[PDB]
Amino acid sequence: WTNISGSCKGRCFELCRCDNLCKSYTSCCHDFDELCLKTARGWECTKDRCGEVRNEENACHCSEDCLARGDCCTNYQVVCKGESHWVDDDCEEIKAAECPAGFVRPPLIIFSVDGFRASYMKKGSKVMPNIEKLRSCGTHSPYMRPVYPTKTFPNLYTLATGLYPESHGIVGNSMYDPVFDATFHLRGREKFNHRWWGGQPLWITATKQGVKAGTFFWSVVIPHERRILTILQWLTLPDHERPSVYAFYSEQPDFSGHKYGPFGPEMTNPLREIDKIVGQLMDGLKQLKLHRCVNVIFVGDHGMEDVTCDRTEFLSNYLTNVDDITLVPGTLGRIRSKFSNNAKYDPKAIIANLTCKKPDQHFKPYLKQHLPKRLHYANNRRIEDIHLLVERRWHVARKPCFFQGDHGFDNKVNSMQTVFVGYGPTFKYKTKVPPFENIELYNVMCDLLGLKPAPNNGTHGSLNHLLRTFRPTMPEEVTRPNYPGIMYLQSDFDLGCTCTEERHLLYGRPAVLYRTRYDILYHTDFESGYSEIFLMPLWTSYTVSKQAEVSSVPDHLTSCVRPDVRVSPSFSQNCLAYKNDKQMSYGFLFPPYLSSSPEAKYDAFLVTNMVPMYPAFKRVWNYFQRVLVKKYASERNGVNVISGPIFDYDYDGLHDTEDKIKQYVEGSSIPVPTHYYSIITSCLDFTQPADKCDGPLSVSSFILPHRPDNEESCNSSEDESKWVEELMKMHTARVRDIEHLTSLDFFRKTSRSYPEILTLKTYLHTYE
């Protein structure tokens, strides 16, 4: 209960209740609506109202005293004192923060916009003149990549925390938690309960370190114009109460985008309306002389794609009993049993029945651990085991148009990409930066406010090139390598088997960042870090020049496997284990096919180059190694390739210890990888060959799932040239994803600054 006879006079939107959540499922004071939500005579002055008698019933004021009180209309001195709009002024550089004396730091305003597709910036100064001036005058990128699923709640909270949805808990707009036995929905009281929201959002991080925060939630009752005036009012408060971080949120252009689709003619007016709101903010900041003091982030949560009811796949066309499953539908699918203790429910049968039933099926089923690792969408009990990736432009529903637009698809889809602009004293002047992921902004926003960020999934230092003015450190090597010479006789081995750095290790040896034991093994054509714990290489580095020749293996040397005299028999694999395992075969990390001579080819058959590989996966690996590596080398002027295994049985995106591994080669202690990776590097200046590179690097990487069939690839019955490249692209990855998965640290000795290397490690080759 609260005594609502108490007033909100002189405390509207305070930091009885008068806060932004008091209309949600609480209760405001009796005069909240009268005092705080005044809408009389609009949000703009006229020549008629200039120097008028002050009326407290007005929404904003044009009287002579309004400036000292800090509640002028945003255009007051434009209309009444003959000043120009902020937009009409010439672009002047801010070489330092021009804040009133008393300010301890420049303020940050985060202007978030729902469903702002990246291609909307193409409209230009005709439709959005304020946003366009912010973009051209400040720091900007072509786009910003959201997280998966590309929905509002997961992305806005990712922006707040720097965390993947699996880690912060908001894995969807809709979700079920089986420990709570409760459902989160866009509509309802449940979403306000704190138990759903993990991590530490920017506003808590700020408050804990002595920095006051504005509201990061506005009620839908409060109009957009009031929100701006509230922020401007808070900026005029005294030094003890004045916040340093502020947020604005708009539900446009999302709401319109759903109705009319991203390229509808009706989209123009919503964009005009948003820019009108941005113009009020900049004009109001100019009135306060804070227009060269505040840092402003214009950011979206995701894009928008053409979707209609005609393009709906129905699960009832694939499964028999759709009345026994619950489906979270639309631009993604999540399937679970409707009733617990249902013996008729079979997950394998559901996945089999959804797998490659038509030539042109517009979704694909996955167990969540088999999803592309770049999505980081497994490690949460709120994410269901069965997942459907839906093809762009389509929906999935259970069984059988108001809307023309939707989103939520795979976060590398062009139409899901969104927007970023940074403008102010701490952002650079007229600078263009490469695309980046929204997980990185938490760290930047902490830097901008002088805060120590909480542990997050950004790579602190990767966005230093956005700011005019944090120094990142390279991690400490935990285990030093051994460099074994010849230590064992050929006759010491009973494995049942029968029969450099300047060229092949260009960017230093990788640093092992966990406690283990491993050997560096040199060869003519390749180098490797051989693990005596996991009985295979952690990594294998080799360089293929532009004009390198692919030979083949002679018929008699097909099953050649040789003991390596530098490694003990008891820390080596054996062929007998592979003969006994009916389901498992083996492959090589450096391919025999790319040997520089017949003599060197014998090094590639060493037991220390061998790795366990299902026959179905060898179809993928042989095509990658024999055909594609030469093709990449030809096209990129040679390539350096680093390949190795990944073990992630608990699908948490992090390198497994020994106890997490659930699958070994039959009757052995040879662990089976869940995935295989490659990091393919060359010169960005493609006129220089990869081994003699002067400038910036170019990188692409993948994390291929190590699966005993090719059920993911619908054309796998065809030749590898019809389906393998398509599989690899789907599983593209940042080098940083591989570092988490292996506890390795790559690119430790280059000619580039460490900040530029962290940008390189966060790059995703999207193929879009």
Ligand X SMILES: *[C@@H]1O[C@H](CO)[C@@H](O[C@@H]2O[C@H](CO)[C@@H](O[C@@H]3O[C@H](CO[C@H]4O[C@H](CO[C@H]5O[C@H](CO)[C@@H](O)[C@H](O)[C@@H]5O)[C@@H](O)[C@H](O[C@H]5O[C@H](CO)[C@@H](O)[C@H](O)[C@@H]5O[C@H]5O[C@H](CO)[C@@H](O)[C@H](O)[C@@H]5O)[C@@H]4O)[C@@H](O)[C@H](O)[C@@H]3O)[C@H](O)[C@H]2NC(C)=O)[C@H](O)[C@H]1NC(C)=O
Ligand Y SMILES: *[C@@H]1O[C@H](CO)[C@@H](O)[C@H](O)[C@H]1NC(C)=O
- Binding stretches for Cl ion (CB under 5 A): 97, 99, 103, 545, 638, 689-691, 696-697, 752, 756, 760
Task: Write the single-letter amino acid at 235.
Answer: L
275 is in an annotated binding site: no
Tell me if 399 contacts ligand Y by CB under 6 A. Answer: no
| C-alpha 666 chain-centroid distance | 38
236: how many CB neighbours lie within 10 A of its CB?
15
Q: Let me know if 183 is a catalytic residue.
A: no
Token pair recorded at residue 510: 């990788």
Nearest-approach distance from CB 93 to Cl ion, in angstroms: 17
Rg (CA), the chain: 30
Part of the chain binding ligand 7NB (CB under 6 A), chosen from 212-220, 279-287, 597-605, 645-653: 212-220
Tell me if 443 contacts ligand X by CB under 6 A. Answer: no
Token pair recorded at residue 722: 């019809």
Tell me if 114 contacts Zn ion by CB under 5 A. Answer: yes
Is residue 665 within 8 Å of 704, Cβ to Cβ? no
Residues 150-169 close enough to bind Zn ion by CB under 5 A: 152
H or E stretch covering 312: strand 312-314
152 is in an annotated binding site: yes
* Interface pattern 707-746 for ligand X (x via CB under 6 A): ---------------------------------x------
**What percent of the chain is helix, strand and coil (3-state, nearest 5)?**
30, 20, 55
Token pair recorded at residue 65: 């005293």
Binding-site size, ligand 7NB (CB under 6 A): 20
Residues 642-671 close enough to bind Ca ion by CB under 5 A: 648, 650, 652, 654, 656
Pick 228 or 561: Cβ nearer ligand 7NB: 228
Binding-site size, Mg ion (CB under 5 A): 3
Part of the chain binding ligand X (CB under 6 A), chosen from 363-371, 451-459, 696-704, 720-728: 451-459
443 is in an annotated binding site: no
* Interface pattern 299-328 for Zn ion (x via CB under 5 A): --x---------------------------
Query: How far, in Å, CA of 540 to CA of 272, rounded?
Result: 54
Tell me if 457 contacts ligand X by CB under 6 A. Answer: yes
Tell me if 647 contacts Mg ion by CB under 5 A. Answer: no
Tell me if 586 contacts Mg ion by CB under 5 A. Answer: no
Part of the chain binding ligand Y (CB under 6 A), chosen from 177-185, 342-350, 582-590, 755-763: 342-350
Tell me if 639 contacts ligand Y by CB under 6 A. Answer: no
Tell me if 13 contacts ligand 7NB by CB under 6 A. Answer: no
Q: Look at residue 349 and give the partner it binds from ligand Y, ligand X, Ca ion, none, a contact being a CB closer than 5 to 8 Å depending on partner kind.
A: ligand Y
- Kindly provide the b/e burial profile for residues 325-357, where b requires at least 16 CB atoms within 10 angstroms of the residue's own CB: bebbbbbbbbbbbeeeeeeebeeeebbeebbbe
Nearest-approach distance from CB 678 to ligand 7NB, in angstroms: 36
706 is in an annotated binding site: no
Q: Which of 199, 194, 239 is nearest to 99 (CA)?
A: 239
Q: Which of 74, 139, 150, 152 is catalytic?
A: 152
* CB neighbour list of residue 23: distance below 8 Å, 6 or more residues apart: 219, 221
Query: How far, in Å, CA of 19 to CA of 7, rounded?
Result: 13
Q: Look at residue 199 and give the partner it binds from ligand X, Cl ion, Zn ion, none, a contact being a CB closer than 5 to 8 Å depending on partner kind.
A: ligand X
Q: Which of 385, 403, 386 is nearest to 394 (CA)?
A: 403
Nearest-approach distance from CB 108 to Cl ion, in angstroms: 12
Part of the chain binding ligand X (CB under 6 A), chosen from 91-99, 144-152, 164-172, 273-281: 164-172
* Interface pattern 102-121 for ligand 7NB (x via CB under 6 A): --------x-x---------
> Using the 8-state DSSP alphabet, how is residue 625 labeled?
I
Is residue 190 within 8 Å of 200, Cβ to Cβ? no
Burial class (CB in 10 A: 0-12, 13-18, 19+), 612: buried
Query: How far, in Å, CA of 93 to CA of 318, rounded?
Result: 60
Query: How far, in Å, CA of 579 to CA of 574, rounded?
Result: 9
Tell me if 376 contacts ligand X by CB under 6 A. Answer: yes
Nearest-approach distance from CB 354 to ligand Y, in angstroms: 9
Pick 204 or 550: Cβ nearer ligand X: 204
- Would you say how long the chain is, in residues? 768
Tell me if 315 contacts ligand Y by CB under 6 A. Answer: no
Q: Look at residue 88 and give the partner it binds from Zn ion, ligand Y, Ca ion, none, a contact being a CB closer than 5 to 8 Å depending on partner kind.
A: none
Is residue 594 within 8 Å of 548, Cβ to Cβ? yes
Query: How far, in Å, CA of 579 to CA of 146, rounded?
Result: 46
Tell me if 455 contacts ligand X by CB under 6 A. Answer: yes
Binding residues for Ca(2+): 648, 650, 652, 654, 656
Residues forming the active site: 152
